[PDB]
Design a protein around this nucleic acid. Structure first.
Ligand SMILES: [Mg+2]
Ligand SMILES: [Mg+2]
Ligand SMILES: [Mg+2]
Ligand SMILES: [Mg+2]
Ligand SMILES: [Mg+2]
Ligand SMILES: [Mg+2]
Ligand SMILES: [Mg+2]
Ligand SMILES: [Mg+2]
Ligand SMILES: [Mg+2]
Ligand SMILES: [Mg+2]
Ligand SMILES: [Mg+2]
Ligand SMILES: [Mg+2]
Ligand SMILES: [Mg+2]
Ligand SMILES: [Mg+2]
Ligand SMILES: [Mg+2]
Ligand SMILES: [Mg+2]
Ligand SMILES: [Mg+2]
Ligand SMILES: [Mg+2]
Ligand SMILES: [Mg+2]
Ligand SMILES: [Mg+2]
Ligand SMILES: [Zn+2]
Lengths: 122, 110, 116, 53
RNA sequence: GGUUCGUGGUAGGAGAGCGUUCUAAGGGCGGUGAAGUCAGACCGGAAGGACUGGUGGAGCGCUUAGAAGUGAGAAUGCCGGUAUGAGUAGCGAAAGAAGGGUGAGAAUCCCUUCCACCGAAUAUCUAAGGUUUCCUGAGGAAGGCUCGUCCGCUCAGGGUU
RNA sequence: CCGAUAGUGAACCAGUACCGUGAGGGAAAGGUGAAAAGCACCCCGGAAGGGGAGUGAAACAGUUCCUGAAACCGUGUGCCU
RNA sequence: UUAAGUUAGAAAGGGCGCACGGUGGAUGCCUUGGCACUAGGAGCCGAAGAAGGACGGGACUAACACCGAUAUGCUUUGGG
């Protein structure tokens, strides 16, 4: 597995941040090395989603950030990233056995030449 | 006939500009532009404008065909150096050369 | 009146640099190494005008030695023979006969054998 | 620690024989009709070759 | 005018000269192109001198004599320029991420959210010291160890009761 | 007598800038053209910069702009490797 | 065809020569400034506030020069 120029806690923070962003926005632009780590971490969260159990919900809730995605309106209740992972995202991969992400190569970034990719669901 | 364009006194060390200008020398202008677009260097966008200026000059001043143009010449000449100082340890100041470049590109019909 | 250094220095150094034309790198560009290179080129040229005369006499002698051994003489016998015979043709000329008209050289080597 | 002699022009140039860039790995598109890096999305079309994105 | 004997050379003695700037006198060159500068395969025993062509765009040779800040390769010389080392060392303690925006251009500016750091401080005042760095608008040459649309930077206007 | 490294330290807003607690130390830096006639207009470019067009005897005189040596940096190629 | 032998050509880059550029500011030409003198004049200023300054004064004014709240000038006499 990749050390991403970070300590163990920083890296675990970075993978939690990127994972949540990928679940919330369904498409993010990041570096190639970051995108090749995320695909593992996000496809495991989507698997827990599809599981759907309380146990599975609590495994995902131990990793996914507590970000409000949107506020829907029923008395307007906010929807958290974790609810969007079990209510919206996972069930749309119910008959797909793995491979919920795809990395498109975009090109190098002006400031540091970093190879940039779009990583997206489906 | 052939069209010239020069970017005089560009802040960009000549060495750094030459390493890229070497890729386009003799290529077709279509290809040359693509090489500059996908060559991730600081020199690339600067050299692209000079090369695109050369092509505009070749299309507007000399009615040449922009679909039949090869980069005949492309060279980088040293411009005047900006002299700077970097304070080093023990009160000593070491020189810094902020170098400049004259980038010339010449396109020719074939 | 003040005399500034003007022109004479440049004119004198540029002549020397020109005499170093063809020399490797800095030796054809920079006055200081050009000047040494030119001094040394003249020294070699003076020495090699003497060495050239020695060099050619050794080349002629080798070729006469060859042409004479095809006649069953050595160079030392042939040159002794010619001295006794009275023939005063020098080595540059014999060497030329020994390459260009071997028939003539053989005639001289005949004269040599007769004197011995 | 320090250079004993200045490096000559010839020698400096020989050392730089290898300091150079490689041409980009690029080809023309079908849709765009323009150049692109293989295995990248073409931004002229705004997609991955002919496959729409 | 010829015979004879000579002609390696450091310190050093002796001699004859080359060239530079200036003066005088004489005689000249020069916008039909002076000096300088570049080039060349020419001339003299040397120092050196011409000629031709390019560049240059207004002064300069020659003769005889005179006078000297009169000739540079070395002084760890002085000053300037430019190399080499080298695309090398370094880029000065530290946690960022994505989305949205702005823009010719964005890792680096703005906003949002999450994350992380200080918390007898990395917070809040005040004195010294600095002296406009403060605010607003515009800018991105240089400065900022990268970038830059940003700034304690540049330019305007302001602002201290 | 000097002719911009000379001549004053100072031909130029110089005892300035800068250095120093201070006394004090102390620079660098002249030349568009006869005349601004200082490049309308078009073109690439965000600009810088450039290419045309034009002015001029000249712009390879283009607001630090007479000349423009050498080091040094490049491009091309006749011979060699 | 097999065998044996000989010889060519090549340039990643490099060298020499040449051509053309860049950089740089030597050189020549030039002079606004200096240097040394000669002849003549003059050799002092200050409580009637000096030397030397500071801050001000222009339609807009950062600097220099000039001027002092009468401030980028006032009066007068001559020149033009
Ligand atoms: Mg920990
Ligand atoms: Mg210190
Ligand atoms: Mg002998
Ligand atoms: Mg002798
Ligand atoms: Mg002798
Ligand atoms: Mg003269
Ligand atoms: Mg002298
Ligand atoms: Mg020297
Ligand atoms: Mg090294
Ligand atoms: Mg290393
Ligand atoms: Mg490093
Ligand atoms: Mg830092
Ligand atoms: Mg504590
Ligand atoms: Mg501020
Ligand atoms: Mg910068
Ligand atoms: Mg700003
Ligand atoms: Mg002076
Ligand atoms: Mg001068
Ligand atoms: Mg000039
Ligand atoms: Mg009157
Ligand atoms: Zn395409």
């Amino acid at each position: 597995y990749r050390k991403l120029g970070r300590t163990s806690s920083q890296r675990k923070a970075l993978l939690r941040d990127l994972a949540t962003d990928l679940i919330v926005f369904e498409r993010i632009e990041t570096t190639e090395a970051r995108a090749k780590e995320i695909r593992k971490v996000v496809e495991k969260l989507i698997t827990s989603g599809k599981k759907g159990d309380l146990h599975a919900r609590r495994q995902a809730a131990a990793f996914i950030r507590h970000e409000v995605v949107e506020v829907v309106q029923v008395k307007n209740r906010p929807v958290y990233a974790l609810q969007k992972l079990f209510d919206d995202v996972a069930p749309r991969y119910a008959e797909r056995q793995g491979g919920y992400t795809r990395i498109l190569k975009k090109g190098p970034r002006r400031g540091d030449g970093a190879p940039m990719v779009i990583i997206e669901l489906v | 006939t052939s069209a010239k364009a020069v970017a005089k006194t560009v802040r960009i060390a000549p060495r750094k500009a030459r390493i890229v200008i070497d890729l386009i020398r003799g290529k077709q202008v279509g290809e040359a532009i693509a090489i500059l677009k996908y060559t991730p260097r600081s020199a690339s966008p600067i050299i692209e404008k000079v090369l695109k200026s050369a092509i505009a000059n070749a299309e507007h001043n000399y009615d040449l065909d922009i679909n039949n143009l090869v980069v005949e010449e492309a060279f980088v000449d040293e411009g005047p150096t900006l002299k700077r100082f970097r304070p080093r340890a023990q009160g000593r100041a070491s020189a810094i050369n902020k170098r400049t470049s004259h980038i010339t590109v010449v396109v020719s019909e074939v | 009146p003040r005399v500034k250094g003007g022109t004479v220095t440049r004119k004198r150094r540029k002549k020397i640099v020109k005499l170093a034309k063809g020399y490797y790198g800095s030796k054809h560009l920079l006055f200081k190494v050009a000047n040494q290179a030119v001094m040394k080129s003249y020294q070699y040229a003076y020495r090699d005008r003497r060495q050239k005369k020695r060099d050619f006499r050794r080349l002629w002698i080798a070729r006469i030695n060859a042409a004479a051994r095809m006649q069953d003489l050595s160079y030392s016998k042939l040159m002794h023979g010619l001295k006794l015979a009275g023939i005063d043709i020098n080595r540059k000329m014999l060497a030329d006969l020994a390459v260009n008209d071997i028939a003539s050289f053989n005639t001289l080597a005949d004269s040599a054998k007769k004197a011995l | 620690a320090v250079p004993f002699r200045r490096t000559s022009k010839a020698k400096k140039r020989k050392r730089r024989t290898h300091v150079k860039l490689q041409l980009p790995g690029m080809n023309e598109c079908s849709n765009c009709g323009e150049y692109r890096l293989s295995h990248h999305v073409c931004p002229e079309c705004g997609q991955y070759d002919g496959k729409d994105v």
